[PDB]
Amino acid sequence: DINTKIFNSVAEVFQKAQGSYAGHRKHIAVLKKIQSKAVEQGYEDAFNFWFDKLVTKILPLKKNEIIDRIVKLVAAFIASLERELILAKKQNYKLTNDEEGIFSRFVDQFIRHVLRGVESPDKNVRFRVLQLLAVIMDNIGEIDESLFNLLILSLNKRIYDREPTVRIQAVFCLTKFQDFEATRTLVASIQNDPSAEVRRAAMLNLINDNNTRPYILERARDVNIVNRRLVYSRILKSMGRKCFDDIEPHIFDQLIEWGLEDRELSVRNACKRLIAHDWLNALDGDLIELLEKLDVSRSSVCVKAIEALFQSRPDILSKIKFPSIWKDFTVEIAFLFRAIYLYCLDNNITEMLEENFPEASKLSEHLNHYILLRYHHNSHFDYNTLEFIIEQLSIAAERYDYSDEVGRRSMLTVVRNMLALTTLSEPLIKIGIRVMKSLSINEKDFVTMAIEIINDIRDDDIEKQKEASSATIVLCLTRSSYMLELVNTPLTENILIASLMDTLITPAVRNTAPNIRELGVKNLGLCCLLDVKLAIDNMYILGMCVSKGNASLKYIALQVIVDIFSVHGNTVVDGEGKVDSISLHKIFYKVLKNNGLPECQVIAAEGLCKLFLADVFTDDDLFETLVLSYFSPINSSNEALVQAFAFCIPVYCFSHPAHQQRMSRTAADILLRLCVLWDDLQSSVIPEVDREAMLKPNIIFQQLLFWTDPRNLVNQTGSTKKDTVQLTFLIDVLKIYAQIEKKEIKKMIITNINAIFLSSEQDYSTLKELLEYSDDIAENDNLDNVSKNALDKLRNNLNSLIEEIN
Amino acid sequence: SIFEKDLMAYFDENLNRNWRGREHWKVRNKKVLEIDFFKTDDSFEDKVFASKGRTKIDMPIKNRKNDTHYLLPDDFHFSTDRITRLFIKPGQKMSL
DNA sequence: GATGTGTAGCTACACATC
DNA sequence: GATGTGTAGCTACACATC
């Protein structure tokens, strides 16, 4: 009697609660009524028994199935009971009606019930069992030891579940046990869990103290975009100013670097808004104080950050001026001055350029006062601080108008005296030269002045003693290279360079100190870019530098050869008194083959792609060797090389039809060779093993169709649709298809052929030929069934596109 | 020339997806209306709590850990701007 | 000012099927 | 693994709200 009445009372609440959230608060108020009435009659366990039974009805349901209203009903019922308990304890000195016992007994009994399906075979049951626990975990109150150890054990097993969905519910349940062991489990999944959404769940709900923060912020380079975005959108936002006090400056500096340059705009905007809005408002708009947080020695990112701040806040922009009150200058204001001024020029802010900045002559005054204060001394972190201010002011000076003749002439005396200091740091040499170049507006004027500065330094060492000290030659070769870098006229028009080349450039190439020789090559290379004859006479010597030289020399000497070809074309080889092109082709082989020098492989590959794009290199066999190194197993561990090819081969194939063709002709043979490499690699057994160091022939094949797809060309004539570049390639693959022996490979090719692009405009004859070879394969050497269907799909399309004969 | 620009606009802008090479290249172009809580289930619906049997329900111990930690590799930011310009004279560029 | 809430539409992922 | 379809998580601009 009573027992049946309880079931109906509780069953009716569920029967109408599944349909709508409307009357849930009444349902909860009723359930507590049925319960309280059931316990006084002595039928407490009857209420718990029927409450359990009825919840078992929803477990088989799929996720996102609207009859999770019961789930939301169970959670609301547990929460309210606990609320009454906590409240009742405060109201009353002593709980007189066993209120705590009933709750303690109901919750323990209920958890153990649902835990009966925590390892159920059904995907859906496992999910909702963890879902139920997740939504009621916080309000369980106090549990005895046995129940506690049963939850952590059951959860620690399900963190490794098959379905990611249940694993997300597995972390949610674990976030409630943090504060010991629960954190270690979350730290293991935030790094090792394959599902990007489990990483995300653990990321957002982890404790975020001084211990876990390194693991949370590590997600800023997660392969998933949302995860990389949320570290900026939520974690660093919720921390507010905690980032500046609690995060170590170097981890902090890297985070903003990754964000401002991330490959996804979504992530970039997330980081930008964090700077231009959240952090700036957090510091009450004090623009200078923000720059103190963003360390400015890492300027490149501070530029991306400030350049982003100006776009998000044009009003703050107009305000800042630089009156003659320069007495307040610091690294932050020095940086601002540069960023603001060059930002104005790039966007033609007429009004601001006019009065917001001092006049040229007035800037040279300040610029000098800092040089005197640093280099004419007679503390250390003051030296680095002054050198930085000189740099910033000098970058703005390079682009100053200099309409005033006095200003132009005043600044010129400051840089000329700066470049004459033997103690000037390389950063200030680089920019110092750039300003002198801007001031002359006459290349010969700029050259004659720089040579004097160089020779004066050289002579003062020789005369003060007959070839100058090695330390001095460095000072001249670095100043010399930064000069030649901006010289764009033949040597014959500047007679001093040939004399500069006679007295320390060519001697430097003959030196014994590696660092001087490398500098001597860089200047020699820079001279070759001006006089063709000079390049020709040194091609042999550079080639031998790249053959026998150490790692560093090999590195610089090879860039010179690529730059000589980039400028002078093929005129420096294959002629009278010149080197043979094959002699240099082989040099690139050894370098692109030099597994032991990865950094050298990069420029050999990046460079070889530059010369094919420029149409100075055209040998197919070399090009073929170029692509095979990309897919080769030995090079797969050279990230710089992999990313280089990943960008360069596409641009070569898509740059011009004549280049895409060269891939089509060679692509088929490349696939064949790479099929032999992979196959031979799966069979061979060698302690180092690793058969995964190579892309499977199905992805290689796939990749080759993408590069040969005429729809990816940058230029679209409209007559590029009748392009057979992709057809001829597939034909070449159906011909070499015969030469493959293994079945799984022959399956990897034939199952992807349908990605090809078919159009009626394509040549009839070449479509016919492609069909002939498709039929020949289909009707003779019989395939798997999945392969057969793929090949029959192609023929069907061919048979249809061909059929448009009218 | 336009060749640089024509190449510059097309490529840098959202051909990054394949910036890692390797397989990482995409280039990709009612029911259960209601329940009746009153109707009986006579002891064989509650068999929801069956044992796994030979169903798996667990990850292969292979995938539980990955040395890569599912992070990006270092970004060397190969850009069209980087290929058009010389090595030792970045200001100047080859015939382009 | 700052938080809600309506709409819509986008893109890299995850999901499903065999 | 090669298909095709579904969705979490924003992204933008519009207003009402306290």
Numbering used by the authors:
A (entry chain A): 8 to 74, 76 to 187, 204 to 347, 349 to 403, 411 to 497, 568 to 908
B (entry chain B): 384 to 412, 456 to 522
Task: Pull text from the paper.
Condensin protein complexes coordinate the formation of mitotic chromosomes and thereby ensure the successful segregation of replicated genomes. Here, we identify a direct DNA-binding site in the eukaryotic condensin complex, which is formed by its Ycg1Cnd3 HEAT-repeat and Brn1Cnd2 kleisin subunits. A peptide loop of the kleisin subunit encircles the bound DNA and, like a safety belt, prevents its dissociation. Firm closure of the kleisin loop around DNA is essential for the association of condensin complexes with chromosomes and their DNA-stimulated ATPase activity.
To unambiguously determine the position and orientation of DNA bound to the Ycg1–Brn1 subcomplex, we solved the co-crystal structure of Sc Ycg1–Brn1 with 18-bp dsDNA to 2.98 Å resolution. As expected from the surface charge distribution and the results of the mutation experiments, we detected additional electron density corresponding to a DNA double helix within the Ycg1–Brn1 groove. In the crystal, DNA duplexes pack via base-stacking interactions, with one copy of Ycg1–Brn1 contacting two-thirds of one DNA molecule and one-third of a symmetry-related DNA molecule. This conformation is most likely necessary to compensate for the fact that the 18-bp DNA is slightly too long for the 1.5 helical turns required to produce the 21-screw axis observed in the crystal and is not a consequence of binding to Ycg1–Brn1. Several conserved basic residues of both protein subunits, including those we had mutated (Sc Ycg1K70, K71, Sc Ycg1K849, Sc Brn1K409, R411, and Sc Brn1K456 corresponding to Ct Ycg1K100, K101, Ct Ycg1K917, Ct Brn1R539, R541, and Ct Brn1K559), interact with the phosphate backbone of both DNA strands. Comparison of free and DNA-bound structures shows that Ycg1 and Brn1 undergo fairly minor conformational changes upon DNA binding. The change in the conformation of the latch segment might either help to stabilize DNA binding or alter the affinity between the latch and the buckle. The latter hypothesis is consistent with the formation of hydrophobic contacts between a valine residue located between the two charged residues (Sc Brn1V410) and the buckle residues (Sc Ycg1F808 and Sc Brn1W408) in the DNA-bound structure.
